[PDB]
Design a protein around this ligand. Structure first.
Ligand SMILES: O=P(O)(O)OC[C@H]1O[C@](O)(COP(=O)(O)O)[C@@H](O)[C@@H]1O
Lengths: 552, 551
C-alpha cells in the first residue's frame, strides 16, 4: 500500500535458536505432571483423556517424528484483533512448508463460525507474502461464535474430516483457549486423530500466568497509546490550559492503563483492581482527583493528563450495591411502574432508596441517573445488568467540574478547569506490530507446528524468556487444563480460564505506587516516540516496562 | 525515554548556501510586491514596508549590517506545531557562529510575554535538551493580539530595555498579523529593531507561490494518517463499524485532504467544495447515507469517514446562523453577563430572525449549546472555537435517523454501529519528521542571515521543498503580500488572509479522480508510524500535498 508497508513486508522475524534447527534435530523434553488451579477433582471427569499432561520444552539433538507425509492444517482467528496475528499465520505456513513442500494451510473465515460453515480459503505463498509483518486480522477476519451443542461439535469434526485436516490452530483469548481444550478432548474422546493447539492472544494482557509471560499484541497496542498520551502531555505542557482525560479500551483489567502510566508519567492514573481492593467510594475517587487539580492550580499549573481504564465503573463496589438495590425496588413493586414515564418514576426510586444510596444516586449527573434506570429496564433473562451506558471519563469530568464550580462560588478555587476527553482503542489493535510482537508471534506459530509434529494435542504454544534477545528465547507447550477452574453459572459447572488482572503485589504496580504522588504534583512527563522499525537494536527491540519489571 | 535520547543527536540538514560564511552570502533582490485584496486601504496602513523585494541568497560578498554581538528576542505563538524547538536551535546556532557573545532571549507564553517583560535567556545547555523534540514548552505559547497604541508602546519599551537588535515571531496567520504590524510600528516611529516572521502551522493555511508549505503540517498529518489507516485496518478486520473521524485544520481542509490521499477512506468531506456548491447540511447527510447503503447492499457494513472541524463555517445556512448568533451576543452582551447556558439559549432564540430560528432549532440540542460556546470562546483574534464543536457526532446522529427511515420501508437491512473520533491535540506536540526537523532548523538559521543583512518585515522562506535539503533555496518574503481586510469582533481590520484548499489544484483534483472508487471499494492504504532512523527513502518522505503541488 504505502512505502512503509512494502519495506516492513521484507522484515525477517527472529526465532528462538532451537526453532532454527532441523525438525529431525529437535527433541522433546518432558516435564512433571501438571494439575489444575482448583477443582483438580472435577477436571479429571470433564477432561478424562487430557489432564496432567507434562509441560513440554525443546532441546537440540536427534528425534523421530509423528509425520512424514504432507500436513494439512486449519487455522482460526477468534475475538478482537491484536497486532501480530498475521505473523502467527506466517510462522505456521513457513514451518509446514519447511517440513514438506506439499503441506497446506486453510484459513477459516470470520472466527470459529467459518469452521462450522466450512467457509475457508487456502493460504498460498503469494497470499501469505502480502500479509507478512502487517497489522489486522483481515487475512481471514475474526468472530467469536462458541462451539457448544452436540450438533455443533459434530459439524466441526465433519468439516475437519472433509478438509483432510491433521490439526487445528486457534488464535484467541481466554474463552477460545478454553474452547480449544474441549475440542481437543472431544476429538480424543471419539477416537479421532486431529490435534488442537492454542495460541495466547490479547492486547489487554488478561491471559497470563507463571508459564505465559505475556499475551501477544499488548506490546504494540501500549506503544501506540503511550505515544499518543506522551504527545498530549507535551501539548498540555506547551499551552498550559487543558486537562486531558484519556480512556483506554478494555473493561476487564488495568494492565494497559498501568503500562501507559509507566511509559508517560501522567498526573493521574486510576487502577480498577486497587479501587476494588480498597473499596473506594465514587466521592473518594472524585475528592482525590479534585485535590490533585487544586494543588497544581496553586503551583500555577492549570493543566494535566489523566488515564482511566474503560471498565472502571464496574470496579466500584458502591455502584453495584446501588444497582442491586434499584432493581430490587423494581422486581418488587412491579405493577407500580405500569405505565410510567421516567423522571416521574425517577422520584419513585428517589423516595424508595436507602438514605445513603439516595445520596450516591443524586450525586450523579442527571443523564447518568436516567442511564442506570435504562440499564435495569433491559436485564437479560437471568435478571443481571451491566453499566455500559455510563462512560467513566465523562462521568468523572462532569462531577469534577461540579465540585470545582461550588468551590469557586465560595472562593476556594482561583484556577481554570478546561477538560478534553479522549477514547483510544480501535486505532491500536490493528496497528503494525512492533519487532517484539513480530518476533514473538512468528515464534508462537512456528512453535505450534513443532508441537503438532510431535503428536501433541490440547497444548498452548509457549515462548519464555521474552526479556532476552530472541535467539535466547525458550520454546515449549503448556497443557490447557492446568490453567483452568470450574465456574458455576445458572446451576451448571462449565470449565473456564480466568482473566489475569493486575497483581497489586507485582513489581509494575509497586513501581507506580512508589512514584505517582511525584508525577501528580510535578511535570515529569516522558515522551515516547512512534514505534521504530529501523535503527539500533535497543530502540527497535524495546519491550514493555511491565515485562522488564516482572522478569529481570 | 530512550527514543528522545537518540533523536536528540540528529543533525538537521541545511541548504548548501547557509553552510557558507556570513561574509560569503550575498542578497539577490527581485520582483516587487503588493497585497492580495483591499490593496488601497492596506497601502495607507503599511506605509513603510509595503512592496518590498523578494530575497534570495547566493555565494558572494554582501554588506553586513552588524559588526558587534547580537541580542535577539524570540516568541512562540498560537497552537504548537512539531519543529518549533528546531527553529529556535537554528537561530541559536547561527548567532553563536556569527559571534559567540550573542544572546538569545525567549519570551514566555506568546506575545503576552513581550508585553509583560516575562522572559528567560536561552542558553547552550537549555537549547541542547530541546533539539529535535516536539512541543512549544521551552517558553510555552499563547494567542494574544497586539492592537492598541499602548500595547505597541509597551512592546517598544520592553524591546528597548532588553537591548534587542531583533525580534523573531514564530506562528500562524494570527501571529504573522502581529509581526507585520509590529515591524510597521517600529519603522514608523523610527527604531532600529528588526522583526522577522517564521511560517508555522499544522493547518497549512499560511501559503503562497513563495511559501510552499507551513511547518508542522507534514508531521501532524503523518500521525493523523497512521491512526486513520489503523482504523481502516480494524474496520476491514472486523467488518462491522462505521468510524467518523474529526480532524484539526481550523477553517481550511488541507489536513483532511492530505489524510484522505494517505489512506483512501470511504468518505472525506471538503468544506471548500461544500461552499462552492452551496450545499445544505441535509444534502451532505443524504450523500453520505447513499454511500453507506450502497456498501451495505454489497455486503460491507463498515467504513471510515473523515470530517474537517471547519465544516460548519462553510455550509451557507450554518455559517449564516453562526454570524447572527455572534451579532446578537456582541450587541446585547450585558444581558448574557451572568447567565447559564439554558438561559443564554432562551435569549438567542427570542432574538433570532424566523428563518434562522428554524435552522437553529432543527439541530440536535447538544449542537445548539455547542454553537453558543463556539461563539463565546472566540480567541483574541476573533476565530470561533471549532475544535470544541463535535461535528462528527452531528453527522452520526443525522445519518442514524436517515438510515432508520430507510429501514422503516425495508430499504436498509444492515446494522449501523458508528464510532466517533477526534484526532487533533495528539498531533501538535509530536516529534517532528526529518522534513519538519530539517525545514525548521533552516528557517531559524535563515532568519539570522536575514537579520545580519539588515532586513525587517520579512518571512523566513525556504524554497524547493520537494528536493534534497542541500538543494533548497534560502531567502525572504515581505509579510504585506499575504494580507487583506476582514471583519473580526464586528469591526474591519488588516489580517493575513487564510489560504484555503484550491479546487483547481492538483491535490483536490487527484482526490476527485479517485474518491468514488474509494467510496464503494475497500482500497485503504496503511501508512505506519513516522520513522526517524533508517533508509533515506522512508525517513525523508514528504506529504502527498507538497509532491502534487510542486509537480
Ligand atoms: O489550541 P486551541 O486554543 O484549543 O485551538 C485549536 C486550534 O489550534 C490549531 O490546532 C492550530 O492553530 P494555529 O496553528 O493557527 O495556532 C487548530 O487546528 C485548532 O483549530
Amino acid at each position: 500500500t504505502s512505502l512503509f508497508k512494502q519495506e516492513r513486508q521484507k522484515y525477517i522475524p527472529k526465532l528462538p535458536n532451537i526453532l532454527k534447527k532441523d525438525f529431525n534435530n529437535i527433541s522433546l523434553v518432558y516435564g512433571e505432571n501438571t494439575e489444575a488451579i482448583q477443582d483438580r477433582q472435577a477436571l479429571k471427569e470433564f477432561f478424562k483423556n487430557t489432564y496432567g499432561l507434562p509441560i513440554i520444552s525443546f532441546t537440540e539433538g536427534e528425534s523421530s517424528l509423528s509425520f512424514s507425509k504432507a500436513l494439512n492444517i486449519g487455522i482460526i482467528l477468534s475475538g478482537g484483533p491484536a497486532p501480530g496475528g498475521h505473523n502467527v499465520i506466517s510462522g505456521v505456513f513457513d514451518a509446514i512448508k519447511k517440513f514438506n513442500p506439499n503441506s497446506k494451510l486453510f484459513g477459516f473465515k470470520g472466527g470459529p463460525l467459518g469452521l462450522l460453515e466450512n467457509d475457508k480459503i487456502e493460504l498460498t505463498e503469494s497470499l501469505i507474502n502480502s500479509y507478512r509483518n502487517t497489522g489486522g486480522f483481515d487475512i481471514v477476519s475474526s468472530g467469536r461464535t462458541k462451539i457448544e451443542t452436540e450438533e455443533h461439535y459434530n459439524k466441526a469434526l465433519f468439516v475437519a474430516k472433509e478438509n483432510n485436516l491433521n490439526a487445528i490452530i486457534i488464535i484467541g483469548g481466554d474463552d477460545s483457549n478454553t474452547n480449544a481444550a474441549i475440542l481437543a478432548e472431544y476429538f480424543k474422546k471419539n477416537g479421532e486423530n486431529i490435534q488442537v493447539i492454542g495460541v495466547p492472544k490479547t492486547i489487554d494482557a488478561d491471559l497470563r500466568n507463571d508459564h505465559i509471560e505475556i499475551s501477544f499484541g499488548f506490546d504494540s497496542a501500549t506503544k501506540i497509546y503511550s505515544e499518543l498520551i506522551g504527545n498530549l502531555c507535551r501539548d498540555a505542557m506547551s499551552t498550559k490550559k487543558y486537562w486531558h482525560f484519556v480512556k483506554l479500551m478494555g473493561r476487564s483489567a488495568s494492565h494497559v492503563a498501568l503500562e501507559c502510566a509507566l511509559k508517560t508519567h501522567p498526573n493521574i492514573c486510576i487502577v480498577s483492581e486497587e479501587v476494588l481492593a480498597k473499596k473506594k467510594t465514587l466521592s473518594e475517587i472524585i475528592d482525590e482527583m479534585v485535590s490533585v487539580i487544586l494543588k497544581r492550580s496553586l503551583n500555577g499549573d492549570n493543566f494535566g493528563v489523566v488515564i482511566v481504564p474503560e471498565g472502571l465503573i464496574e470496579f466500584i463496589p458502591e455502584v453495584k450495591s446501588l444497582m442491586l438495590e434499584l432493581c430490587d425496588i423494581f422486581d418488587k413493586n412491579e405493577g407500580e411502574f405500569k405505565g410510567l414515564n421516567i423522571e416521574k418514576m425517577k422520584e419513585i426510586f428517589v423516595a424508595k432508596l436507602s438514605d445513603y444510596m439516595k445520596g450516591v444516586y443524586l450525586s450523579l449527573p442527571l443523564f447518568i441517573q436516567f442511564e442506570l434506570i435504562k440499564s435495569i429496564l433491559e436485564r437479560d433473562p437471568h435478571g443481571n445488568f451491566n453499566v455500559s451506558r455510563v462512560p467513566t471519563e465523562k462521568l468523572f469530568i462532569e462531577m469534577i467540574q461540579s465540585r470545582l464550580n461550588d468551590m469557586k462560588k465560595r472562593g476556594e478555587y482561583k484556577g481554570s478547569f478546561t477538560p478534553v476527553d479522549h477514547f483510544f482503542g480501535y486505532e491500536g489493535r490493528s496497528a503494525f506490530p512492533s519487532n517484539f510482537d513480530s518476533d514473538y508471534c512468528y515464534s508462537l506459530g512456528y512453535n505450534a507446528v513443532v508441537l503438532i509434529l510431535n503428536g501433541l494435542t490440547g497444548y498452548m504454544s509457549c515462548i519464555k524468556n521474552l526479556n532476552l534477545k530472541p535467539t535466547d528465547w525458550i520454546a515449549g507447550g503448556v497443557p490447557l487444563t492446568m490453567l483452568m477452574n470450574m465456574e458455576e453459572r445458572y446451576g451448571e459447572k462449565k470449565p473456564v480460564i480466568k482473566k489475569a488482572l493486575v497483581d497489586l503485589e507485582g513489581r509494575p504496580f509497586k513501581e507506580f505506587v512508589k512514584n505517582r504522588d511525584k508525577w501528580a504534583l510535578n511535570n515529569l512527563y516522558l515522551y515516547p516516540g512512534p514505534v521504530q522499525y529501523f535503527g539500533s537494536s535497543e530502540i527497535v527491540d524495546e519491550i514493555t516496562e511491565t515485562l522488564k519489571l516482572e522478569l529481570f
